[PDB]
């Protein structure tokens, strides 16, 4: 089982941030961070959301993938174990 994933960011100016993944419930893995939105020309891309921390399993969610833009967003941190 796993926590909910964070909402992806959406395209714009700038592309919006992906949401952090949800913590795992007790006994569950972390949810994945949302990806960042992409930027229109001249606009920044959004950061990926952090992965959610695990609910005791040691498996955090993945950080989201940063969105393309000017400049591109960073990927999110992985969730804590």
> Can you give the residue range of the structural domain that contains 20?
1-81
Distance CA 7, CA 49 (A): 9
Q: How many domains, the chain?
A: 1
Resolution of the solved structure (Å) = 1.0
Q: Is 42 exposed, middle or buried (0-12, 13-18, 19+ CB in 10 A)?
A: exposed
At 16, phi and psi to the nearest 5? Answer: -85, 160
27/9 Cα distance (integer angstroms): 28
User: Experimental method used, please?
Assistant: X-ray
């Amino acid at each position: 089982c796993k926590g909910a994933d964070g909402a992806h960011g959406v395209n714009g100016c700038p592309g919006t941030a992906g949401a952090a993944g949800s913590v795992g419930g007790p006994g569950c893995d972390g949810g994945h961070g949302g990806n960042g939105g992409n930027g229109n020309p001249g606009c920044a891309g959004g950061v990926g959301g952090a992965g959610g921390a695990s609910g005791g399993t040691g498996v955090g969610g993945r950080g989201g993938k940063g969105g393309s833009g000017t400049p591109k967003g960073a990927d999110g941190a992985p969730g804590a174990p």
